[PDB]
PDB file of C-alpha atoms and ligand atoms in Angstrom:
ATOM      1  CA  UNK A   1      -0.047  -0.041  -0.047  1.00 38.91           C
ATOM      2  CA  UNK A   2       2.201   2.830   1.328  1.00 43.10           C
ATOM      3  CA  UNK A   3       5.567   4.167  -0.327  1.00 42.96           C
ATOM      4  CA  UNK A   4       8.037   6.448   1.160  1.00 45.93           C
ATOM      5  CA  UNK A   5      11.200   8.265  -0.180  1.00 46.39           C
ATOM      6  CA  UNK A   6      13.775   9.320   2.358  1.00 45.88           C
ATOM      7  CA  UNK A   7      16.567  11.659   1.135  1.00 48.51           C
ATOM      8  CA  UNK A   8      19.452  12.704   3.435  1.00 49.96           C
ATOM      9  CA  UNK A   9      22.294  15.219   3.077  1.00 47.97           C
ATOM     10  CA  UNK A  10      25.278  14.342   5.132  1.00 49.89           C
ATOM     11  CA  UNK A  11      29.051  14.887   5.625  1.00 50.76           C
ATOM     12  CA  UNK A  12      30.083  12.986   8.824  1.00 49.04           C
ATOM     13  CA  UNK A  13      27.074  10.576   8.713  1.00 50.80           C
ATOM     14  CA  UNK A  14      24.878  11.751  11.561  1.00 49.52           C
ATOM     15  CA  UNK A  15      22.020  12.757   9.106  1.00 48.98           C
ATOM     16  CA  UNK A  16      22.331   9.478   7.243  1.00 46.25           C
ATOM     17  CA  UNK A  17      21.903   7.730  10.564  1.00 46.21           C
ATOM     18  CA  UNK A  18      18.789   9.792  11.144  1.00 45.96           C
ATOM     19  CA  UNK A  19      17.516   8.828   7.733  1.00 46.37           C
ATOM     20  CA  UNK A  20      18.382   5.189   8.449  1.00 46.22           C
ATOM     21  CA  UNK A  21      16.395   5.225  11.600  1.00 46.94           C
ATOM     22  CA  UNK A  22      13.379   6.746   9.868  1.00 47.92           C
ATOM     23  CA  UNK A  23      13.539   4.214   7.102  1.00 48.26           C
ATOM     24  CA  UNK A  24      13.738   1.402   9.644  1.00 50.47           C
ATOM     25  CA  UNK A  25      10.698   2.788  11.522  1.00 53.22           C
ATOM     26  CA  UNK A  26       8.705   3.278   8.267  1.00 53.32           C
ATOM     27  CA  UNK A  27       9.598  -0.227   7.043  1.00 55.35           C
ATOM     28  CA  UNK A  28       8.384  -1.663  10.429  1.00 59.02           C
ATOM     29  CA  UNK A  29       5.173   0.185   9.786  1.00 57.67           C
ATOM     30  CA  UNK A  30       4.666  -1.710   6.574  1.00 56.47           C
ATOM     31  CA  UNK A  31       5.905   1.057   4.320  1.00 58.37           C
ATOM     32  CA  UNK A  32       7.952   0.378   1.273  1.00 55.42           C
ATOM     33  CA  UNK A  33      10.953   2.893   1.570  1.00 54.35           C
ATOM     34  CA  UNK A  34      13.364   4.325  -0.949  1.00 55.32           C
ATOM     35  CA  UNK A  35      16.405   5.946   0.596  1.00 57.46           C
ATOM     36  CA  UNK A  36      18.835   8.003  -1.325  1.00 60.16           C
ATOM     37  CA  UNK A  37      21.318  10.954  -0.885  1.00 59.91           C
ATOM     38  CA  UNK A  38      20.110  14.417  -1.812  1.00 58.25           C
ATOM     39  CA  UNK A  39      22.634  15.231  -4.447  1.00 56.12           C
ATOM     40  CA  UNK A  40      21.864  12.001  -6.390  1.00 56.11           C
ATOM     41  CA  UNK A  41      18.173  12.413  -6.220  1.00 55.80           C
ATOM     42  CA  UNK A  42      15.787  14.273  -8.599  1.00 56.42           C
ATOM     43  CA  UNK A  43      12.659  15.661  -7.139  1.00 55.25           C
ATOM     44  CA  UNK A  44      10.679  14.266 -10.136  1.00 57.23           C
ATOM     45  CA  UNK A  45      11.604  10.800  -8.869  1.00 57.54           C
ATOM     46  CA  UNK A  46      11.334  11.744  -5.163  1.00 56.78           C
ATOM     47  CA  UNK A  47       7.741  12.841  -5.361  1.00 55.40           C
ATOM     48  CA  UNK A  48       6.487   9.503  -6.659  1.00 55.58           C
ATOM     49  CA  UNK A  49       6.213   8.186  -3.008  1.00 54.09           C
ATOM     50  CA  UNK A  50       3.152   8.807  -0.877  1.00 53.15           C
ATOM     51  CA  UNK A  51       5.484   9.906   2.088  1.00 55.94           C
ATOM     52  CA  UNK A  52       8.307  12.323   1.564  1.00 58.72           C
ATOM     53  CA  UNK A  53      11.123  12.886   4.057  1.00 56.65           C
ATOM     54  CA  UNK A  54      14.117  15.199   4.029  1.00 50.84           C
ATOM     55  CA  UNK A  55      16.985  14.628   6.637  1.00 50.35           C
ATOM     56  CA  UNK A  56      19.654  17.228   6.246  1.00 50.41           C
ATOM     57  CA  UNK A  57      22.356  19.045   8.304  1.00 50.96           C
ATOM     58  CA  UNK A  58      22.966  22.749   8.820  1.00 49.86           C
ATOM     59  CA  UNK A  59      26.397  24.275   8.163  1.00 50.66           C
ATOM     60  CA  UNK A  60      28.324  27.640   8.561  1.00 47.61           C
ATOM     61  CA  UNK A  61      25.868  29.393  10.865  1.00 47.86           C
ATOM     62  CA  UNK A  62      22.537  28.420   9.245  1.00 45.94           C
ATOM     63  CA  UNK A  63      23.686  27.479   5.710  1.00 44.60           C
ATOM     64  CA  UNK A  64      21.788  24.920   3.661  1.00 46.23           C
ATOM     65  CA  UNK A  65      23.702  21.896   2.423  1.00 45.39           C
ATOM     66  CA  UNK A  66      25.265  23.257  -0.842  1.00 46.04           C
ATOM     67  CA  UNK A  67      24.598  19.778  -2.631  1.00 43.61           C
ATOM     68  CA  UNK A  68      20.932  20.189  -1.695  1.00 42.86           C
ATOM     69  CA  UNK A  69      20.182  23.664  -2.971  1.00 44.97           C
ATOM     70  CA  UNK A  70      18.762  22.367  -6.298  1.00 44.23           C
ATOM     71  CA  UNK A  71      16.713  19.718  -4.784  1.00 42.81           C
ATOM     72  CA  UNK A  72      15.417  22.355  -2.232  1.00 41.86           C
ATOM     73  CA  UNK A  73      14.441  24.851  -4.993  1.00 44.43           C
ATOM     74  CA  UNK A  74      12.911  22.202  -7.207  1.00 47.76           C
ATOM     75  CA  UNK A  75      10.695  21.023  -4.209  1.00 51.37           C
ATOM     76  CA  UNK A  76       9.085  24.360  -3.898  1.00 48.32           C
ATOM     77  CA  UNK A  77       8.451  24.548  -7.602  1.00 46.28           C
ATOM     78  CA  UNK A  78       6.545  21.141  -7.513  1.00 48.57           C
ATOM     79  CA  UNK A  79       2.796  20.483  -6.830  1.00 48.86           C
ATOM     80  CA  UNK A  80       2.952  18.235  -3.840  1.00 46.97           C
ATOM     81  CA  UNK A  81      -0.729  18.388  -3.123  1.00 42.94           C
ATOM     82  CA  UNK A  82      -1.738  15.052  -1.506  1.00 38.75           C
ATOM     83  CA  UNK A  83       1.785  14.191  -0.437  1.00 41.66           C
ATOM     84  CA  UNK A  84       2.624  13.654   3.318  1.00 41.89           C
ATOM     85  CA  UNK A  85       5.840  14.975   4.450  1.00 43.16           C
ATOM     86  CA  UNK A  86       8.232  15.193   7.506  1.00 40.74           C
ATOM     87  CA  UNK A  87      11.508  16.879   7.912  1.00 44.00           C
ATOM     88  CA  UNK A  88      14.267  15.881  10.520  1.00 45.64           C
ATOM     89  CA  UNK A  89      17.928  16.814  11.149  1.00 44.35           C
ATOM     90  CA  UNK A  90      20.944  16.433  13.151  1.00 45.52           C
ATOM     91  CA  UNK A  91      22.687  19.657  13.994  1.00 46.47           C
ATOM     92  CA  UNK A  92      24.504  21.219  16.942  1.00 49.03           C
ATOM     93  CA  UNK A  93      22.747  23.150  19.608  1.00 48.14           C
ATOM     94  CA  UNK A  94      25.871  25.297  20.282  1.00 48.65           C
ATOM     95  CA  UNK A  95      24.765  27.404  17.240  1.00 47.88           C
ATOM     96  CA  UNK A  96      21.814  28.657  19.097  1.00 48.62           C
ATOM     97  CA  UNK A  97      19.258  30.248  16.827  1.00 51.05           C
ATOM     98  CA  UNK A  98      20.993  28.608  13.899  1.00 53.80           C
ATOM     99  CA  UNK A  99      20.273  25.075  15.452  1.00 56.66           C
ATOM    100  CA  UNK A 100      18.955  22.836  12.475  1.00 61.51           C
ATOM    101  CA  UNK A 101      17.697  25.743  10.438  1.00 60.13           C
ATOM    102  CA  UNK A 102      17.917  23.565   7.351  1.00 56.88           C
ATOM    103  CA  UNK A 103      15.017  21.530   8.881  1.00 57.86           C
ATOM    104  CA  UNK A 104      12.914  24.777   9.100  1.00 60.38           C
ATOM    105  CA  UNK A 105      13.880  25.657   5.399  1.00 60.36           C
ATOM    106  CA  UNK A 106      12.783  22.189   4.117  1.00 60.06           C
ATOM    107  CA  UNK A 107       9.550  22.237   6.280  1.00 62.22           C
ATOM    108  CA  UNK A 108       8.685  25.689   4.724  1.00 65.98           C
ATOM    109  CA  UNK A 109       9.480  24.378   1.212  1.00 67.99           C
ATOM    110  CA  UNK A 110       7.188  21.362   1.591  1.00 68.98           C
ATOM    111  CA  UNK A 111       4.551  23.949   2.848  1.00 68.39           C
ATOM    112  CA  UNK A 112       4.863  26.116  -0.290  1.00 72.39           C
ATOM    113  CA  UNK A 113       4.648  22.919  -2.396  1.00 69.52           C
ATOM    114  CA  UNK A 114       1.211  22.133  -0.887  1.00 69.15           C
ATOM    115  CA  UNK A 115       2.291  18.889   0.849  1.00 69.64           C
ATOM    116  CA  UNK A 116       0.534  18.009   4.270  1.00 66.58           C
ATOM    117  CA  UNK A 117       2.755  17.744   7.239  1.00 64.67           C
ATOM    118  CA  UNK A 118       2.470  14.301   8.662  1.00 63.93           C
ATOM    119  CA  UNK A 119       4.560  14.984  11.983  1.00 63.37           C
ATOM    120  CA  UNK A 120       6.216  17.707  13.983  1.00 62.23           C
ATOM    121  CA  UNK A 121       9.672  18.292  12.654  1.00 63.80           C
ATOM    122  CA  UNK A 122      12.557  16.564  14.532  1.00 64.01           C
ATOM    123  CA  UNK A 123      15.555  18.488  15.503  1.00 63.07           C
ATOM    124  CA  UNK A 124      18.476  16.242  16.854  1.00 59.44           C
ATOM    125  CA  UNK A 125      21.630  17.381  18.585  1.00 59.76           C
ATOM    126  CA  UNK A 126      24.571  15.566  16.900  1.00 60.30           C
ATOM    127  CA  UNK A 127      24.347  11.817  17.141  1.00 59.18           C
ATOM    128  CA  UNK A 128      20.986  10.297  17.550  1.00 58.46           C
ATOM    129  CA  UNK A 129      20.506   8.507  21.043  1.00 58.93           C
ATOM    130  CA  UNK A 130      17.738   6.679  22.702  1.00 60.05           C
ATOM    131  CA  UNK A 131      15.409   9.666  23.093  1.00 55.53           C
ATOM    132  CA  UNK A 132      15.996  10.840  19.687  1.00 53.88           C
ATOM    133  CA  UNK A 133      15.220   7.371  18.270  1.00 53.44           C
ATOM    134  CA  UNK A 134      11.948   7.321  20.184  1.00 53.19           C
ATOM    135  CA  UNK A 135      11.127  10.791  18.653  1.00 56.16           C
ATOM    136  CA  UNK A 136      11.940   9.392  15.083  1.00 57.11           C
ATOM    137  CA  UNK A 137       9.587   6.555  15.665  1.00 54.84           C
ATOM    138  CA  UNK A 138       6.746   8.794  16.566  1.00 54.08           C
ATOM    139  CA  UNK A 139       7.689  10.985  13.664  1.00 54.26           C
ATOM    140  CA  UNK A 140       7.372   7.829  11.307  1.00 55.29           C
ATOM    141  CA  UNK A 141       4.012   6.789  13.054  1.00 56.62           C
ATOM    142  CA  UNK A 142       2.736  10.277  12.424  1.00 57.03           C
ATOM    143  CA  UNK A 143       3.629  10.126   8.721  1.00 59.01           C
ATOM    144  CA  UNK A 144       1.901   6.732   8.282  1.00 61.89           C
ATOM    145  CA  UNK A 145      -1.239   7.553  10.147  1.00 62.10           C
ATOM    146  CA  UNK A 146      -1.521  10.899   8.162  1.00 60.09           C
ATOM    147  CA  UNK A 147      -0.839   9.210   4.813  1.00 57.56           C
ATOM    148  CA  UNK A 148      -3.295   6.382   5.464  1.00 57.69           C
TER     149      UNK A 148
HETATM  150  C1  FMN B 201      31.759  24.588  10.502  1.00 54.85           C
HETATM  151  C2  FMN B 201      30.552  24.149  11.106  1.00 54.85           C
HETATM  152  C3  FMN B 201      29.305  24.871  11.183  1.00 54.85           C
HETATM  153  C4  FMN B 201      28.068  24.468  11.640  1.00 54.85           C
HETATM  154  N1  FMN B 201      27.013  25.234  11.798  1.00 54.85           N
HETATM  155  C5  FMN B 201      25.819  24.642  12.299  1.00 54.85           C
HETATM  156  C6  FMN B 201      24.683  25.444  12.429  1.00 54.85           C
HETATM  157  O1  FMN B 201      24.713  26.646  12.144  1.00 54.85           O
HETATM  158  N2  FMN B 201      23.581  25.032  12.947  1.00 54.85           N
HETATM  159  C7  FMN B 201      23.519  23.582  13.387  1.00 54.85           C
HETATM  160  O2  FMN B 201      22.509  23.110  13.744  1.00 54.85           O
HETATM  161  N3  FMN B 201      24.787  22.933  13.219  1.00 54.85           N
HETATM  162  C8  FMN B 201      25.828  23.375  12.665  1.00 54.85           C
HETATM  163  N4  FMN B 201      26.927  22.530  12.620  1.00 54.85           N
HETATM  164  C9  FMN B 201      26.950  21.109  13.118  1.00 54.85           C
HETATM  165  C10 FMN B 201      26.487  19.954  12.103  1.00 54.85           C
HETATM  166  O3  FMN B 201      25.238  20.433  11.621  1.00 54.85           O
HETATM  167  C11 FMN B 201      26.353  18.720  13.002  1.00 54.85           C
HETATM  168  O4  FMN B 201      27.598  18.350  13.358  1.00 54.85           O
HETATM  169  C12 FMN B 201      25.600  17.683  12.266  1.00 54.85           C
HETATM  170  O5  FMN B 201      25.517  16.675  13.102  1.00 54.85           O
HETATM  171  C13 FMN B 201      26.448  17.097  11.192  1.00 54.85           C
HETATM  172  O6  FMN B 201      25.619  16.126  10.396  1.00 54.85           O
HETATM  173  P1  FMN B 201      26.324  15.149   9.284  1.00 54.85           P
HETATM  174  O7  FMN B 201      27.170  14.247  10.183  1.00 54.85           O
HETATM  175  O8  FMN B 201      25.066  14.432   8.711  1.00 54.85           O
HETATM  176  O9  FMN B 201      27.070  15.884   8.375  1.00 54.85           O
HETATM  177  C14 FMN B 201      28.065  23.016  11.970  1.00 54.85           C
HETATM  178  C15 FMN B 201      29.165  22.206  11.953  1.00 54.85           C
HETATM  179  C16 FMN B 201      30.402  22.691  11.567  1.00 54.85           C
HETATM  180  C17 FMN B 201      31.657  21.739  11.345  1.00 54.85           C
HETATM  181 NA1   NA B 202      18.333  24.463 -10.252  1.00 55.48          NA
END
């Protein structure tokens, strides 16, 4: 029944770890999941899933991943009405009001595209631990219930 595409942007693996946890939780909720890195993914292919997820870092005081700028821009130009989305990220709370700003940007981009938020965005500090894992499971549960 349900499909999902999880894209991640990463440099030291934390956000790929986050994407992996989300893919696992979705798979364990009987979702067929595609997972790919953002720079190797076209929005036209991404949008074919019922559930859309971006997991991406924040850099240089609030900067988006440079390899994800095209994907980000293409996302906002696409009609994603009927799609269920969620955004998550690992970042560093030391950057204060720049903590995981990329998560906020992608959540806004999905909003302009007309997609329906399936779960509250998840902002993780550095590596995901037990609490983060439980939060990413509720995240996945929210997407499935919203999409189904
Ligand atoms: C130079 C530099 C600048 C950073 N700036 C931010 C930032 O503005 N906001 C944030 O949340 N994290 C910032 N970070 C932290 C990364 O987002 C964080 O380490 C994240 O876990 C890396 O994810 P990745 O392993 O998937 O690449 C910065 C890290 C570095 C090295
Ligand atoms: Na472009």
